[PDB]
Design a binder for this molecule. Structure first.
Ligand SMILES: *[C@@H]1O[C@H](CO)[C@@H](O)[C@H](O)[C@H]1NC(C)=O
Ligand SMILES: *[C@@H]1O[C@H](CO)[C@@H](O)[C@H](O)[C@H]1NC(C)=O
Ligand SMILES: *[C@@H]1O[C@H](CO)[C@@H](O)[C@H](O)[C@H]1NC(C)=O
Ligand SMILES: *[C@@H]1O[C@H](CO)[C@@H](O)[C@H](O)[C@H]1NC(C)=O
Lengths: 196, 594
């Protein structure tokens, strides 16, 4: 049995960071060599798991979150960071036994007319919590007066767009991020690495 | 939710579509400047209209968060920048009249063509013709004809529009809670709120006057030397005791004395420094020029530039297939996009301008982390000063020898040092009195305390005492001589060129002291000095967040403009001039009568 490690990495489109896509992976052989197919990996941080010892352990579940952010926002995909992605869009817990993988996608994403399909949340009442997803698009009231719905002054919608033109810099170019979070619940493990 | 918190969330939803719209507008402008078509003009018009409408809407929705109820400083500065009414305080009719005035003045100056001699078939224009025949002319009669011809036709058209333009600008500035348009312009060198690091809009006038008082003796000595050199070439045209004629300063308005170097060079037998021959026989291109500039910058310590800079910047003209203005400018398009637009020839001057614009680009990359409204120089002279630091450093003979353009067989002597210092003084010192004169005249005009029926009279009586330039022919009130200048006609502040001159030498002295360099200041090399690079970058990465008074101290240790870096930079030239022109009169007589 080979579960979609290839399909999550090789997808035609990637979900926005504000509403990211989480895939629960179970009943698998690890076959982690599929991940290393992609060469241009911009970051392969491996908080809590050795980047060469993955193919010896067994976990109950594996979650592969995938989203698109800027190049300078990849540093916020790490336990203990702060900013606009790590507290309003995608927060990950302090322990976070897992790996973070990100590569540039200025060709697959991005468009000279402006790729506005990739949005993030610039304003929220409270900071996000580890592995929470806020999809609601209500209007943020920023002060002392109810918005009473779609609104203009002191109101302000929450989700902002990125634009992703291909002439941008390197820290402003789209960067597809795939985050692997291994779950080690006290249950019989269903994902294991091959061994003779 | 306090008013400051509301302000912080507005200026966080502004800083995000502003940046997007500014990138769109800058990309439109860049592709027009690289490809002059009609579709590109339409794209610029659309993008600029969208950006201006967004800016106006954001300003009217910012007039809400009151400034007196905000305690933060970054938020206060951002709201100050966003809340400027500008020309909206004027009535609709008055605003449209002012816009038409500005457009007509700009078009008249740009398309101005004098056809006085013979029949109107033979007429010259600005860049090749009139500039060429004013730059290199040995005929007093021809120079007088050209000068008085431009001052007559152009000024007589400018003045009727200029007076009402001044009235409208004064009304707008008064409606903007200022005193006059001069005060509105001076409100850029203003720090209000910071204790110990503060400035006033009249303190700028006081400091500029004091700095000019300090620089005056060197200017008098240089003027005496220039007059002595000019009299020998021009018999009976310049009196030994009088002032200097207006049309004899190379430029049409006498802004720069650089073109007055062939008749002023002291050591003609000694050849000047020039690396064009070796640079062209070493097979150097624009790519190698900019690669060596980036090598100099990384040797100093500043970071290397983005990969997209090389593939997007237009460094060479792509033939005559497409039309593109090649004026050297550094483009900061916004979201990580830095480009340089210039037509690069294999020349020393093009090499130096490449270094200058590359320093501009480095300054732009330094403060890219600052908010959108604070992404600028601390004042409007910091950018030019920072660029000129590297422009000065890259032209040193030591750096040229290290790079490879100057052969080791060449030796350095006090004669070559004096030649280089005299050329530098002609370029730099020769424009400080003119800039101070022009901005003082504009400030006095906008003040309105002087009358209106003697504008040219006071202009010419201030030219004599401040610059030492005498009118060759009498001028009545129908003339508008200052309006013949680009910045005066097109409504541009001019004190930036006076301020940058002091700031650049302040920075150069500070960075040469930090580089552990011993000797003359003009033979300094910031290269291979990571300490100097870090000291420069400390001020460079601040942008407009910190006040310019503190930004100056972060690199120099002073809190205002200082003439002393200029004076120690030009000290060898000053001593040489004092030792040489002691037998000739210094200064200009006040009793001259034509
Ligand atoms: C530049 O303009 C020309 C004019 O038709 C056209 O080929 C196109 O818009 C641009 N081409 C290039 C190569 O930039
Ligand atoms: C103003 O707000 C910014 C928010 O980023 C903060 O960093 C800064 O310290 C504040 N100013 C002062 C004086 O505290
Ligand atoms: C920038 O300069 C550094 C020198 O430290 C070099 O290693 C790097 O490859 C250069 N990058 C580019 C894009 O020129
Ligand atoms: C800077 O240092 C490098 C390596 O030490 C050397 O090759 C280069 O010539 C030096 N340049 C200057 C201007 O000192």
């Amino acid at each position: 049995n080979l579960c979609p490690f290839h399909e999550v990495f090789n997808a035609t489109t990637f979900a926005s960071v504000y509403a990211w896509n989480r895939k629960r992976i179970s009943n698998c052989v690890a076959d982690y060599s599929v991940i290393y197919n992609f060469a241009p990996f911009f970051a392969f941080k491996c908080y809590g798991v050795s980047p060469t010892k993955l193919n010896d352990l067994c976990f109950t579940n594996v979650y592969a979150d995938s989203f698109v952010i800027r190049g300078n926002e990849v540093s916020q995909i790490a336990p203990g960071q702060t900013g606009n992605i790590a507290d309003y869009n995608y927060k990950l817990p302090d322990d976070f036994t897992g790996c973070v993988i990100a590569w540039n996608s200025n060709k697959l994403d991005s468009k000279p007319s402006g790729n506005y399909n990739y949005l993030y949340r610039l304003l929220r009442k409270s900071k996000l919590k580890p592995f929470e997803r806020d999809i609601s698009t209500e209007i943020y009231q920023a002060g002392n007066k109810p918005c009473n719905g779609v609104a203009g002054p002191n109101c302000y919608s929450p989700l902002q767009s990125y634009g992703f033109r291909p002439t941008y810099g390197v820290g402003h170019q789209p960067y597809r991020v795939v985050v692997l979070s291994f779950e080690l619940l006290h249950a019989p493990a269903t994902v294991c690495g091959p061994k003779k | 939710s306090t008013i400051e918190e509301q302000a912080k969330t507005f200026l966080d939803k502004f800083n995000h579509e502003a940046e997007d719209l500014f990138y769109q507008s800058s990309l439109a402008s860049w592709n027009y400047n690289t490809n002059i078509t009609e579709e590109n003009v339409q794209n610029m018009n659309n993008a600029g209209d969208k950006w201006s409408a967004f800016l106006k809407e954001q300003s009217t929705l910012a007039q809400m968060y009151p400034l007196q109820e905000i305690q933060n400083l970054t938020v206060k500065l951002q709201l100050q920048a966003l809340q400027q009414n500008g020309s909206s305080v004027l009535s609709e009719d008055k605003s449209k009249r002012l816009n038409t005035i500005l457009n007509t003045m700009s078009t008249i100056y740009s398309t101005g063509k004098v056809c006085n001699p013979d029949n109107p078939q033979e007429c010259l224009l600005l860049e090749p013709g009139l500039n060429e025949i004013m730059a290199n002319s040995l005929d007093y009669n021809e120079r007088l004809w050209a000068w008085e011809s431009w001052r007559s036709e152009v000024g007589k058209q400018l003045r009727p529009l200029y007076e009402e333009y001044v009235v409208l600008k004064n009304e707008m500035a008064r409606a903007n809670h200022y005193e006059d348009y001069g005060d509105y312009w001076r409100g850029d060198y203003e720090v209000n709120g910071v204790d110990g690091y503060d400035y006033s809009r009249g303190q700028l006038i006081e400091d500029v006057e004091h700095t000019f008082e300090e620089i005056k003796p060197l200017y008098e000595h240089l003027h005496a030397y220039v007059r002595a050199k000019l009299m020998n070439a021009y018999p009976s045209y310049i009196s030994p005791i009088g002032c200097l004629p207006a049309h004899l300063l190379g430029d049409m308005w006498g802004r720069f004395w650089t073109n007055l170097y062939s008749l002023t060079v002291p050591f003609g037998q000694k050849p000047n420094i020039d690396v064009t021959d070796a640079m062209v026989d070493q097979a150097w291109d624009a790519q190698r020029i900019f690669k060596e500039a980036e090598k100099f910058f990384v040797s100093v310590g500043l970071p290397n530039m983005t990969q997209g800079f090389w593939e997007n910047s237009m460094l060479t003209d792509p033939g005559n297939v497409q039309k593109a203005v090649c004026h050297p400018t550094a483009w900061d398009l916004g979201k990580g996009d830095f480009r340089i637009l210039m037509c690069t020839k294999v020349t020393m001057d093009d090499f130096l301008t490449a270094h200058h614009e590359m320093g501009h680009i480095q300054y732009d990359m330094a403060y890219a982390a600052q908010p959108f409204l604070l992404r600028n120089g601390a004042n409007e002279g910091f950018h030019e000063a920072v660029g000129e630091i590297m422009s000065l450093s890259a032209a040193t003979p030591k750096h040229l020898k290290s790079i490879g353009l100057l052969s080791p067989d060449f030796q350095e002597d006090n004669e070559t040092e004096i030649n280089f210092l005299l050329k530098q003084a002609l370029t730099i010192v020769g424009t400080l009195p003119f800039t101070y004169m022009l901005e003082k005249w504009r400030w006095m005009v906008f003040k309105g305390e002087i009358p209106k029926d003697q504008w040219m009279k006071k202009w010419w009586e201030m030219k004599r005492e401040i610059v030492g330039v005498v009118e060759p022919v009498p001028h009545d009130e129908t003339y508008c001589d200052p309006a013949s200048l680009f910045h005066v006609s097109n409504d541009y502040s001019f004190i930036r060129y006076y301020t940058r001159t002091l700031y650049q030498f302040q920075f150069q002295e500070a960075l040469c002291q930090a580089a552990k360099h011993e000797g003359p200041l003009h033979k300094c090399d910031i290269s291979n000095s990571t300490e100097a690079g870090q000291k420069l970058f400390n001020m460079l990465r601040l942008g407009k967040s910190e006040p310019w008074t503190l930004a100056l101290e972060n690199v120099v240790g002073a809190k205002n403009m200082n003439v002393r870096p200029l004076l120690n930079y030009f000290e060898p030239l000053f001593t040489w001039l004092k030792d040489q022109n002691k037998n000739s009169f210094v200064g200009w007589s006040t009793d001259w009568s034509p």
